[PDB]
Amino acid sequence: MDQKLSKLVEELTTSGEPRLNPEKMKELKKICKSSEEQLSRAYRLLIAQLTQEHAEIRLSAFQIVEELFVRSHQFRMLVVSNFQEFLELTLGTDPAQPLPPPREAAQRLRQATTRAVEGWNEKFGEAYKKLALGYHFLRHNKKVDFQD
Amino acid sequence: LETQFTCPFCNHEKSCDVKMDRARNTGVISCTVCLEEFQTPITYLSEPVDVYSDWIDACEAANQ
Amino acid sequence: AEWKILLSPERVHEIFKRISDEECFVLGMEPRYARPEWM
Amino acid sequence: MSYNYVVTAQKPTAVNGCVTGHFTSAEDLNLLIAKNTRLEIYVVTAEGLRPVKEVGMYGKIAVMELFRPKGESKDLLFILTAKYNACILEYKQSGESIDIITRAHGNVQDRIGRPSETGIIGIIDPECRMIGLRLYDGLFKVIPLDRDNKELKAFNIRLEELHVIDVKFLYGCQAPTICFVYQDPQGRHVKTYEVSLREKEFNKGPWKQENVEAEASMVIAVPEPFGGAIIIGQESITYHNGDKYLAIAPPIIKQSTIVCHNRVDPNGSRYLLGDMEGRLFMLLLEKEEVTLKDLRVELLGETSIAECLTYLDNGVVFVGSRLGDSQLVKLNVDSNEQGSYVVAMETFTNLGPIVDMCVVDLERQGQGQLVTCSGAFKEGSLRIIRNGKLHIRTVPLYESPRKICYQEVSQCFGVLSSRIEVQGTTALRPSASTQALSSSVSSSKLFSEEVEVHNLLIIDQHTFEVLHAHQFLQNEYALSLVSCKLGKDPNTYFIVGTAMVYPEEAEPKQGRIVVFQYSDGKLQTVAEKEVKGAVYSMVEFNGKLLASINSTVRLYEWTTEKELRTECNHYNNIMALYLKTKGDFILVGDLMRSVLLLAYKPMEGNFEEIARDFNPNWMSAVEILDDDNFLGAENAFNLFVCQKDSDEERQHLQEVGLFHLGEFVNVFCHGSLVMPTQGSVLFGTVNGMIGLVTSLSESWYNLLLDMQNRLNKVIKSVGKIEHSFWRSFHTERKTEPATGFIDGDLIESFLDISRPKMQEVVANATADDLIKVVEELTRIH
Amino acid sequence: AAHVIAEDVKLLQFHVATMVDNELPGLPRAMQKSGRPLKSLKQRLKGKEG
Amino acid sequence: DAEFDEGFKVPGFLFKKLFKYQQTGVRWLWELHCQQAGGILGDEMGLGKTIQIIAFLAGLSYSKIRRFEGLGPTVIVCPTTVMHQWVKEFHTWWPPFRVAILHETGSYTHKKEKLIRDVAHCHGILITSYSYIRLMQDDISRYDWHYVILDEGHKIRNPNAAVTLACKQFRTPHRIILSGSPMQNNLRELWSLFDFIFPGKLGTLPVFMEQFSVPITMGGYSNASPVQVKTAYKCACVLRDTINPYLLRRMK
């Protein structure tokens, strides 16, 4: 049951939709709720898609990741495992690895990920000490404007 | 003028080099040894020695 | 020797000194009156 | 800083080492038995053992080997101490005077090193040229004998294999040769080497390595006629001689591992073997013209669990047992019609590992009376102690006790007992739990090779017979036990904290508090309470039940519904194992944080960390002496006395007295065996030592300290071992000189020395006053 | 020292080179009294009046 | 027989003839040998040192202490003036030793190189003058010697003299220097000496100049400033601390 998952994430990502299609979003939600190794498979899909060079695609992948994060618990451990690389690819903290074009998509990704990090710190921050550390690290070492 | 400068922190001479991304009007200076990195805007007149001297003031100003 | 390595005369003499008569004859160094390691 | 006085109520009795030889005289057949700090000299008479001397080492006797150098009339004695005090001793009897002289002495401790897993092993070359010691991993300390040292100089020969299981010196070797079994990732192996003193290094062995049984755990050096050595595995037995490879697999040994051995014949054609189970076996080497032909194993019979045995003569074998009473037996040529050729000749009482103990004023006299959970698996028995000398009784259980408590209202003892079953499950022998007057099985709803079974045995405190045995659930361990009445109703209960043991988890996560009431000869299940962890300890606390779940100490209340209800919890604990009480103060013995003085606040109804010691000591007991003096015995055989200090600094307890008792204190208990000193707390130990600790006054402490200094200046130790060093507080990462304690034995030895020695000691009051004072100190025990 | 031997082989090389070729670009001329450099075997045979 | 720390035994009768200070010196010298470092005998002229060295060497060979069993092929660099004195003293005090002279006078009457080879293969004490070492440095420095005792080694104070560079070739760590005055003009002599016996201790030469030669020497001038005098005093104390173990300097 791996082909359909890859297909579905492919349509969700490659479409470049400004907003996720809710019906296939719900299909993904239900089908991922089916199994946990399949949840990891979806996570791997998202990580692979994030590296690909397009800001809109990365925005879609990050939005999916945020949905799963807020919805799933094991997904939280799984992503906060590599929170380092996740922040690197979304925030573009390393200048050596900037965010691809378009510029509008990159800025939207920046704003959305800042807000998502803030919300996660508010919600699960105590539950994942590494999240609190990452928030603080962003706030001071990188000086990310959370009020923007 | 010359381009490699003593790291202000690890005191290793000629260990800092600069990357002037003229596209974004931003230049980066990075200490290869201590991996310290300083970011700052540049204009079409700016030079590495101008960028470096922004770093030192940033170091001292924060060190106040 | 950059790809910035300060290459030494002894390295050079050892390298040259192994060259055979035929390759140096190809280079034009006539092997009998000019051997590249006597440089 | 605090003031205390310990003393030996009863010397240790278990044996950890015994060797037979000619030490007292060249002709004497001497049997030397090493009780923990007592080295008892006997002479093997035609019948029994004739005592000739007992002496006090300043050191736990770890190694003891008799050897006869070239030109030496009678065997010399070499003994090592756990603190690595080395000493060679010689028997010199000047008529009536028996003078154990110190030929050569010294200390051999390396400054830093990982003390080896299997403990110190000391072996001597058969030709008596050198002494080989294996103290630390990777090194092999070698002490030459030909180079006559009065100091025991040594040197180290690095050992490329780091995990050695056993090592022996091979016979029939022109140069000293060592065989050892070592463990590496590939499995267990055997190798040999050749020691070269001049080079101070090994050389290639007479024959190359070889792959052995997985559990090859012993090596037996065969004498010259056969040469080579014999490896004993858990399952098979083998013999190697470089080329000869004899292997056997007798199934009879598979049930229990062979732990000990002793050669019977001077030529070594006959060997004895004992297992943990106590079955005594015989190994017989068949020669062929000589070389080795065949290996044979035969069951001679069963004995006490033999930690160490030695054939004396004439079929007389001495069984030295650390777990049960030491035995003297006769090996019959003919079986005893039960497959057994062994018949018990003599038994020496051994208060086994005193796993738990309780004082009772039985008979309602003014004299205390101790009842101890002595013994072990098969030797499990109860001893009863009184002054009459110390009287000793016995009550065999044939199963290990774990805790004991007394219910005077019920006139019985709550004795946790446990047995082993091999298979559903089958009991190996008929024990006390299975032989009870009445029995029942727990049927709880909270939960739904060879295995252990736990039972609660209700014992008459008059006749010492099993009134009841309420067996527990399957895979349940009854850990702690207390007899008391809770809340406000008058019923005195037997409360049993338990745990759910399964092989798949290291830490039990499931346990239940069960309250029983023994009445009408029957144990009724009054109540229950599931908990999320084992209950390592419970104790009454002012009408309430203070129980110790894995890492949470909580106060339980006996509700009017006859049920447990938590009041409060405290969590800053690694593992709260040992608990004691006096007023609103508790003393929590952490597994490694060593104390936590928790005072219960009733006006709030919770706990407060009044203070804590931060030295990481691994506790084995705990007890409150006074309102502000706390005793604790760590696992490394030391006593430390913590006193409340005098800000947050007030939170730091202070270790005021430090002392190396040399034993493993299993239990403390307030009381006194008898009808100047304040308080009295008795402790049992692993080696059967029973001791008493008491307080003093300051001037008395100063005087006694001075007297001890004088005695040390005067009395000459066995191995020239300085007393202060012997009693110095010692740990793997620390070492401090003893303070705040007055060694009982040394002071009480003031009497048995001659008048010039007192006058020398009392060179600065008179000797008679000190004689009176030491008599008074002797009075308490 | 690595840097001292670097300098001393630099100096031996310098002396040989200025023995057969004194006028090198950037490098200093081997000096002599009266304020004048030396004359190498290449100046002996360079040009007019060589 | 006198018994030292580990295994060094000197015959008792030989020990008896020695004075207190000389036997103290023998103990110190064997301690040096234990550390495997060189040393200088600082005893003033005539306090008696050839006796000390002969006693130590005889005890070492006698002790059979552990390449070399006991004493290996040594060499004694001495000025020409005292060579036969050396031979006489060796014969008187320890006649077991084979002492063979490498000199034109000599006692060989054949190729010298044969003599050096034979002494090396015989564990003998070869004596020679500085001139042969300067000339035969190739031949001397190939035989895996054991000791390189320098009698009146203060000749070596010139760091770059041919004799100095010649004698600084022996690879053994046991280097002995005999001179009651191991500094005669200035600190550079001290430097070269401790270069020969313990190459690392004082730093490289220029470092040594900067660190001690200037603050010490310049502070002794009549016009020295008091602060500079205290500086020189400090540095002198430090240097004496540094070099203390390796000079044994008893006065008359």
Binding site: - | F9 | - | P508 | - | G203, V207
Partner: protein
Amino acid sequence: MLGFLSARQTGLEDPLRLRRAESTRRVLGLELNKDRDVERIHGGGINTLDIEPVEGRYMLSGGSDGVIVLYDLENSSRQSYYTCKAVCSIGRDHPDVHRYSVETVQWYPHDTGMFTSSSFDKTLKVWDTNTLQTADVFNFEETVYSHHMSPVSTKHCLVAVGTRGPKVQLCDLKSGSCSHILQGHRQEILAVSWSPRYDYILATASADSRVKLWDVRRASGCLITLDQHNGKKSQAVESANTAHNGKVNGLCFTSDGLHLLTVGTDNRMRLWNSSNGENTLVNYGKVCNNSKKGLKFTVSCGCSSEFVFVPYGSTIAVYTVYSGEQITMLKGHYKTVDCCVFQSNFQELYSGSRDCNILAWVPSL
């Protein structure tokens, strides 16, 4: 675990068994701070940490921004969860702060009344624990990459200093004589260590990629010459011949000074016997280092099997020393890790990285 308690009470097994088994079981279950948090005082990354030897309470720490901070680790509060305060500090306003990143800081062994520190400003200041004033300095001609005082010497008090110059300095604290140098290396010396077993055996490693075990009493350079392939032939004293194929920026003697662990910029670690320098062919796989300066790591003590806590990128990688198993990886930092220390009393690890954080890993349950 109850079986161990039974065996210990009955005298079946020595208490040693339980102690070391439990210590190992705690080290395996190590994970990020449930119940600690280190106060934040450093503006830059933390280059070094050094828990005191005796009583293991106080913990120096040397920041990349020149400040030293002295911590307290004991939970003086009454709560289950607390923080490690800072006791004092050699701040930036102290008259004797280092002008640059502090590269090494070490307690004085045998007594907490002192601590030594080194920095890239070519100075090795010798502080007082109590008065907090630099009671000495050794000024050097090149930057000081690392130092180390002997951990066992009751006699000598030398202080090896490995600088960017090829000379190993041996300063003394007893009357200060910084002249001594060990001749033989060829480039920068990125790490030095004293043997814990033998007083005088110093092992230094240099960017020219070989480690050399000196004896500092001798006058014959080095003793042993570490060679990857441990072939038959022998060599003189140089930094050459490749203990590693790249810069060697790490050293650690195992707990009792027998072997010798060396990480190097060729992404390898090697366990060498330290009696004969014999590469014992344990391997550990591919351990990532690319630090251009010294790399600090540690080994456990009082555990049944011996571990090593080697930084690995931004993660601490735990291996078993003698077997090479990769037990686990600790993933809690965001930049490269630079120093880790081990608290042998309670089997706890503290880790410092460039991200200006000092995390605590404590055993769970």
